[PDB]
Amino acid sequence: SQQVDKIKASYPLFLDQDYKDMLAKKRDGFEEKYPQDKIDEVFQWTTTKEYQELNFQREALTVNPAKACQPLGAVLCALGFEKTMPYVHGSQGCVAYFRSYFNRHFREPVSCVSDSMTEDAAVFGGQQNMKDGLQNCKATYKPDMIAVSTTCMAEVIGDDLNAFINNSKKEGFIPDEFPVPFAHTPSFVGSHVTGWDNMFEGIARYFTLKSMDDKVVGSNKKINIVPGFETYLGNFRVIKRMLSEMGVGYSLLSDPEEVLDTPADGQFRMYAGGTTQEEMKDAPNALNTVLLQPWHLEKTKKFVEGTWKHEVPKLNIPMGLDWTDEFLMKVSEISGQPIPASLTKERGRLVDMMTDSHTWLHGKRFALWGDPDFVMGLVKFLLELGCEPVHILCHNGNKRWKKAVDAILAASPYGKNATVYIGKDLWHLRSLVFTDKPDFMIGNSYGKFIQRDTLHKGKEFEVPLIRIGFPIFDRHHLHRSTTLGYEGAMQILTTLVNSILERLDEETRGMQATDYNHDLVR
Amino acid sequence: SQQVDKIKASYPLFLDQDYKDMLAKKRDGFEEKYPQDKIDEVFQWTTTKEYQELNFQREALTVNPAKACQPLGAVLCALGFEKTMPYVHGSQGCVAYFRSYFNRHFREPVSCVSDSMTEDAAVFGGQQNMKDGLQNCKATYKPDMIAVSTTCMAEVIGDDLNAFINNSKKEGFIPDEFPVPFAHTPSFVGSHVTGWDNMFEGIARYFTLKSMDDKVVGSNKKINIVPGFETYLGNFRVIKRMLSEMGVGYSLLSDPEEVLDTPADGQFRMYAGGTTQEEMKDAPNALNTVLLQPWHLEKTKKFVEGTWKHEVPKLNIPMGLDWTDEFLMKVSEISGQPIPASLTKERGRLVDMMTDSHTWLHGKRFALWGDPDFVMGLVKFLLELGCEPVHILCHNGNKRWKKAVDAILAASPYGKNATVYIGKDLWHLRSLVFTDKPDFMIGNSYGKFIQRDTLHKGKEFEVPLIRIGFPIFDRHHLHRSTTLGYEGAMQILTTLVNSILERLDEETRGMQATDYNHDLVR
Amino acid sequence: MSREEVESLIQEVLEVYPEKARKDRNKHLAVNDPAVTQSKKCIISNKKSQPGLMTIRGCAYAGSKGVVWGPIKDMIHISHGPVGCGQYSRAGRRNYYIGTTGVNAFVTMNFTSDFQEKDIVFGGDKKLAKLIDEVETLFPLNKGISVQSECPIGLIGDDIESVSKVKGAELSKTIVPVRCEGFRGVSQSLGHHIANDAVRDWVLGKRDEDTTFASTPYDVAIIGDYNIGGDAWSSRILLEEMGLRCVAQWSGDGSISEIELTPKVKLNLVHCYRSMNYISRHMEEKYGIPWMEYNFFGPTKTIESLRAIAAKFDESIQKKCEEVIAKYKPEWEAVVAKYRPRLEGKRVMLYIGGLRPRHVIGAYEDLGMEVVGTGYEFAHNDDYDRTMKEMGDSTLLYDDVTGYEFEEFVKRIKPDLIGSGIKEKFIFQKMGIPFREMHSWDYSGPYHGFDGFAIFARDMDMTLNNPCWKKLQAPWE
Amino acid sequence: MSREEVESLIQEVLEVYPEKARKDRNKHLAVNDPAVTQSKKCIISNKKSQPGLMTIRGCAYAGSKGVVWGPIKDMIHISHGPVGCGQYSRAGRRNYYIGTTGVNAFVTMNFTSDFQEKDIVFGGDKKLAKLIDEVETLFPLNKGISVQSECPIGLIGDDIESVSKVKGAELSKTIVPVRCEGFRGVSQSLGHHIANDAVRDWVLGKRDEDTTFASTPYDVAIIGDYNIGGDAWSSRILLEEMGLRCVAQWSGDGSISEIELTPKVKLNLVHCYRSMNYISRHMEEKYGIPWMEYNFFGPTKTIESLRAIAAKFDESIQKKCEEVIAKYKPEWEAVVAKYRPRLEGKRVMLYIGGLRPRHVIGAYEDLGMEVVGTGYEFAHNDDYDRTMKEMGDSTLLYDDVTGYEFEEFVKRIKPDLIGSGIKEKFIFQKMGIPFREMHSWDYSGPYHGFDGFAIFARDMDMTLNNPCWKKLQAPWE
């Protein structure tokens, strides 16, 4: 039943007695459910060290991974170029999924097309799909450029993207002058960040490989910036703002911030902003190229150093205090621009917040996961705050990255209880946070189920989730946040300390039991 | 006892069995405590409608007020002027309190002096205190200006500030040309916002009243901005940014943002930033004066219109979509500057965020309190979101303000269940949120005790607190936030929708009980 | 109205296409005529999508893993292949269930083989066998395993059927191989068909020799309700109030024992014909169980459905049905009285997968609203046969609509409200048109039944009449 | 260090003042010599503050309402006057208690008469009487009412004594008038004295005729512990482990019945001499109860204090004391072993109120730390008499230090750590010097007793050795 003046949705509607009784009848009569005592015993067992030992012996089963497939990264990279349509050569279901994933993270339209290969293409390849799809896409959505990636169907059958696109051009399906960069993005290799790297290298090669003769390093007095797979609009914005404050000429290559933040003013803008083709063509003339997320920009680095002849600086991701300092100093050295007083003051304000919050941050134990560069930047900042990373997980990390993170940890006393895991998933992490309980988790929305499980063990075992990373599906507008630079460090510090204080307030709220510590002033 | 590897502070240390047993022994043996059944019965009674009737019959007793005394506002206003020392003529305990209050809100050093009047000044007056204090303050802290307010001691004995300061100047304690504006700030009248108004009017009069002969309205092509009592640094910053984007020349009068946000770089800067004396002297030459918080800037309005002859626009506080629009349009009309495309895009982005979270915001019921302008701006924005203000409390509001808020409420269907209370305190509001339960509270840190009480009744009766306003003592760095303009509206929208979703996640976390609704995607 | 105006709009929209694409898309757009009950002569459907045109369709794996098999709560469903497919589909569909996740229920988890290059080159059957052993060790209370094939599985010649047979015999566990590779078919629809075939072959008949279940003349099964937001529960309560015993519930909040018990019921109640007609027809042929379509969207449809269902049983059930109708009449009457004045006259366009674009129309008309356009991603021509008689004269029909087409149609028709999926939502919100998600109910619901109708009406009012939609034009523009 | 250098520093700091202020402030700064016993001959204290110099002192209302009376949990304390004083002091001091706030405890609430202009002009006695009736109606479980006068009460001709007498006789309730107007005295200390007088006159002797309370030879009261962060509880546990029965603790977690029961104890244990010496001496004169000062800051002081207190009783208590010391020895030894190497050699300056500037030095010395400077807001000359023998040679002493003075002294001495209140914290954090709040324990604690010592050591290490302090200099400048 419903009351017209207070209508209930599924929660709490299904807690009504009639629904409870009906569900109990269903369970008793027809589900053949394991007895509740057995369920409790098995759950308790899944929280144990013995279960963790079994869990970490997994070799073939992956449970709740913390990564996606390459073409998602390729699509995100393609979205950063002006009037560019991401085009995925392969099956249409992949594109439906990529679009929905990005829709739910960004709460904005995401444009992407497929050439809808089917079993017929499994037998005879997808050349015809490419020709017709390029013609249809150009005719209908009128892009300045089509950036082609691949699904695993196309990769397994070995579709030659270069030959297909060239044949499409010669046979008149699309003009010969129309830019169609491409990249092979096999989903059984690496992850979404690798797909971003492959797509970016493809675009850069397409625009610069054959015209290097008249290129002179440093002649345009700019620094190229390659952000990599980035899902915080604040990060693009803060890099642009910081470079503008220094008076440093720059070229952000793959800038999707406008197309992912269009205003709601009565019209649908399929394209907005983005790196121009002229910027990509002129990039080799820059002073140097800076890679913001080097640990998944390796192929791009090889191309930029080998072909553009740029001496790409060895820089970490500009996260935290020290790495933001180092990034700014390297940019100053490359451009000859001094670091202005505004950035010095902003740095001092971050240091002031650190001194104001250190007493609550000190010694807090964290489990965290995400992409390699983001994870290592977060680890470095946590060590700067006097926090203890304990479980560091990166499902798509590698041995060299793990060694670099271990060297970061060894440089600080706060890293002594930390362990870095690569190739492990969120079920592994669930076991870890049960058997070596941290104070909090920092990760994406998939950590909410771990918080649910730890709460099920008991309130004293619950590990609250702090949502930083990608994807974030169960909170609104957090994609507007910043994690890079001093501003990002400030936002992260605020989030962390206020999560700590919010948990403390929750634990001390009980009247005459724990509220002796429910202080007004913290 | 303690364990050296896991040391416990008061919570949870005092939950150890030995401490619990000792406290039980203390209570049973020597406290003569009312039996627990009596305590439960009285609490339950305090949650009732009959208790609310008794509570609202109060005429002489105030419990948990939601306002402070005038000189606190006067000190905040004085802090906004360059190299200015707030000087409170009266007793030193008041200054100790003002400084600690602002310290805890801003986590920043707050400079203020008193002339330490004692029992002797109760019969001889405080003239000698004023002379020696002005001389000592000027000699020691080297201010460019001393802004004098008063505590209630000085007001009750009727100390003539004008005569005292003039005699200090004639007798050589301070130079005759040294600026010493003053204002009577009686704490038994109005509240802290009134003190801000009085101090600002005193400073403006001191700098402009006697030099009006050569003043020509509009000759400097600027608009004066008076922010009033403002404790969010983001608000000053956003007003400056918005006026700079429009290319509008402006003069922010009383700007304390620099002195309340100095960097931690190894030195203590007692003064920083602030409105200059030259800006205050030249203010009458502006095109017009805009008051950002008109409902406590009445005396300032009288002086600005009567003496400067500025036609002060009738504008609400620039909070929420419509009032930000109206502020920008009035500024455009006054300055002849068009509204630029950046502000149009920012407005469209706020509308985008509204259209996305509307489904979670719609119909949510709120109790809120704070200062009049802030409260009415929040009410207007909540009505714009499709939310229902239910209990609107302003302890320092008046009948005219209440009528204006009632007219705002009547203009929207979402205002149908709203009631505006003036002169009521947080004990009244506690009764209200018990007997007509809203979904959330929006207010300052003093609402945490109401959340504690509602939780004590039961989890189903708990009303979570959303901390917006002043003071915020139990979270860190929220004074950096913004509430004005499109940016402030965006921040508030994000805070509200994510508070809603966080509560929903909490309510649906129970495994096999309510987690059928623990959705990954919201 | 103006059938000629709508046909002209179809032509003007089509002009931008290249010749082959335009000729194809012309067959998938039609102007409705309710007298026309042979939709094939009017509109065409269940064909391949035109490359490069931004279709909304998913893939077989979505139709099988995402739709049919995934909701089965006490089984573990393996996404066999590279990592993407299971990750994008993890918990994206709100097929609600009661269980202890990770212990005896596994719906919102993502089990995958996470194919690497070596698995592509050397095959993945041995990895699959080891994975199944690991599943058994780590999730002992699971009651069966399904293997949902992604594209490379079909491409590399892996034999998951033999692995499933061998391992199932070895561990005495039901292991269901599903060849739902995403390149098969043209949409989620063949995914439905493949999944239904897997149910028939490996699960449905396990108790053909078992006669220990006690049966009654009032045994029914709910087929093709996936319990989005609790829809199936809100329908089951009405069925049980009418005196029926719901033995099985496919597949939302479904368990493998319920599927195995389905052949023992007296009547199959099919909500989604599109996805479960295959198994319903199979059950009629093999076990003699009759089936019937029903509709619990809005009071008129649910009253008609309850009466029709009760008519299939004796007089006592019919009396109980009239009692249920009388008991709920004031609730939906109060809902209508409150919300119809706020929605009377408003016009809606829809675009959803295979059932709802026609099933929700009665609910919209119960609030005095008109559906001026509707269409499907993957419906078949029998679906349009059912759709035409329920839509008004000279209304627009679109099959497998492209993003450009739907945007232009909306720009011309200018409906008051659009109901579609997540990939269209923000597009039309930016155009200033209210939008309700009609797949996930915008994280709201349930909408089925009398209790669902109140939520539906409140949701449509709160979105359609929201103040945000009046603020898209800046006052200085 | 280097006495002549320190007096040089005193002179150089003093040069900026005008001649009257300089001559005054010269008497309040001395270089310490532990041989000196009469502190009057070197440093002067308990004098009026210099106007305009930014003192740290509070007022008498803070000393009475904020310090002595406010912690009494089961009474309602009325801030009588305008709104400011009660609001700024509401829950600002962490005097912990067990109770149901708003029902039977009222510490963190702000009851006030909220004076308006009419109350200033026409007096407030009638408003006070009505307020008391309102309190009785709305908080029936309160066990007494105190009236804490703010500045206007003394200034205008209000007579709260007669109102309190009349109303208390009318309602059979204890109503305690306190004339703690902020203009009285020069600091919080006269507030202490006024509050103690109010306790003596209106509460302490209510049970002089009652002899129903059962007493033992081991009855003690804790006087002048306000239970900051639970300090008094952490001390009470040690006392009761020694075999003593703590009848009352003043005033943290204190109740009015405990105050009334205090005249029945055998020994008064005074923690804060400065604030409660008045009542302790009164109790010795009128009831014959001896009193002694004790110190539970750090293991050395705690052990010495426990042994002296036990020496005041029989042999059984002394044996129990040795058992307590033996039981706790490994815990504080482990704390010392872990944290002394991280703090050994570090130098600290302090500036606090009336007791803690000298009382905490033993704990710092237990962590191998040196106090190179200390001072008081409102101490008296007896306090400095104790401090000098507590402090080392050539250390700086400052009474009622100005903000400028303390900043200059710190800039010269350059200690590794500063302990003071909230108004100095952020100044010295900006100066790049680690700072611990020594009033509120930086929202940490307790620090008293063996359990408190571990928290103290952890806090000092975490702040002193925090990495933030190494980052104040940007690498490019």
Ligand code: ICS
């Ligand atoms: S199964 Fe089908 S697309 Fe019949 S694949 Fe799809 S939960 Fe739709 S119109 Mo999402 S044929 Fe169900 C459907 Fe309808 S996922 Fe749901 S809403 S009634």
Ligand code: ICS
């Ligand atoms: S009462 Fe006094 S200023 Fe003895 S007014 Fe002050 S809780 Fe201090 S040095 Mo705050 S004479 Fe207590 C004190 Fe010491 S408030 Fe506390 S820390 S031991």
Ligand SMILES: [Fe+3]
């Ligand atoms: Fe959006």
Ligand SMILES: [Fe+3]
């Ligand atoms: Fe600060």
